[PDB]
From Swiss-Prot:
GO terms for biological process: signal transduction. Its EC number is 3.6.5.-. InterPro entries: P-loop_NTPase, Small_GTP-bd, Small_GTPase, Small_GTPase_Ras-type. PROSITE patterns: RAS. The keyword Phosphoprotein applies. The modification Phosphoserine is found at S30, S118. CDD domains: ARHI_like. The lineage of its organism: Eukaryota, Metazoa, Chordata, Craniata, Vertebrata. One of its GO terms (molecular function) is GTPase activity. A motif (Effector region) lies at residues 31-39. The keyword GTP-binding applies. This is GTP-binding protein Di-Ras2. Keywords: Cell membrane, GTP-binding, Hydrolase, Lipoprotein, Membrane, Methylation, Nucleotide-binding, Phosphoprotein, Prenylation, Ubl conjugation. It is a lipid-anchor.
Length: 168
């Protein structure tokens, strides 16, 4: 019916911004906290058309049940951190663990956002690449602000899907 992608990460890393750049083409400098939003986009699925549903989650820890349900229903996951915050990278570890616990063949992308702020970088790409290796997932850096690697993010994620032929 649909192909479901969920986006996780700490508050302020750019989850909403990556999703909005991809789906709507827009960017805002203002921070607007999210509870849980979803967006649909028409994509190709096998020799037919379906929707991609993207779930933009919260970085609040106050909704653990909601977060577990979002993991359960997702087909593919994007784990976002900010290259300017080592703490935001560390905060993805428990999320990765919950995906493994609940899912027990799953596209997963580790994404270092805000790569336009390389001068204030705290997480070197080499370190995030090492983590992605241990997690056996893909890695890339993005900038929602610059529209750097935003289309590529979703293209690469759907290309990792081998249980279904999904593309943009
Ligand atoms: N410099 C820069 N700022 C960004 C980027 N992506 C998001 N932001 C900003 O970071 C703040 C949090 O973005 P938001 O999308 O709401 O993050 P979320 O809390 O993870 O959903 C906002 O002020 C955005 O303008 C980016 O790629 N570069
Ligand atoms: Mg948000």
């Amino acid at each position: 019916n649909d192909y479901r992608v969920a986006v996780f990460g700490a508050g302020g890393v750019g989850k909403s911004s990556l999703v909005l750049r991809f789906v709507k083409g827009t960017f805002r400098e203002s921070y607007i906290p999210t509870v849980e939003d979803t967006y649909r986009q028409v994509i190709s699925c096998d020799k037919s058309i379906c929707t991609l549903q993207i779930t933009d989650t919260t970085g609040s820890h106050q909704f653990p049940a909601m977060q577990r349900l979002s993991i359960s229903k997702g087909h593919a996951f994007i784990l976002v951190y900010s290259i300017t915050s080592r703490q935001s990278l560390e905060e993805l570890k428990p999320i990765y663990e919950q995906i493994c616990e609940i899912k027990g063949s799953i596209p997963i992308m580790l994404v270092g956002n805000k790569c336009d702020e390389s001068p204030s970088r705290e997480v070197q790409s080499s370190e995030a690449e090492a983590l992605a290796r241990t997690w056996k997932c893909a890695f890339m850096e993005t900038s929602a602000k610059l529209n750097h690697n935003v289309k590529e993010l979703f293209q690469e994620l759907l290309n990792l899907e081998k249980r279904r032929t999904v593309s943009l």
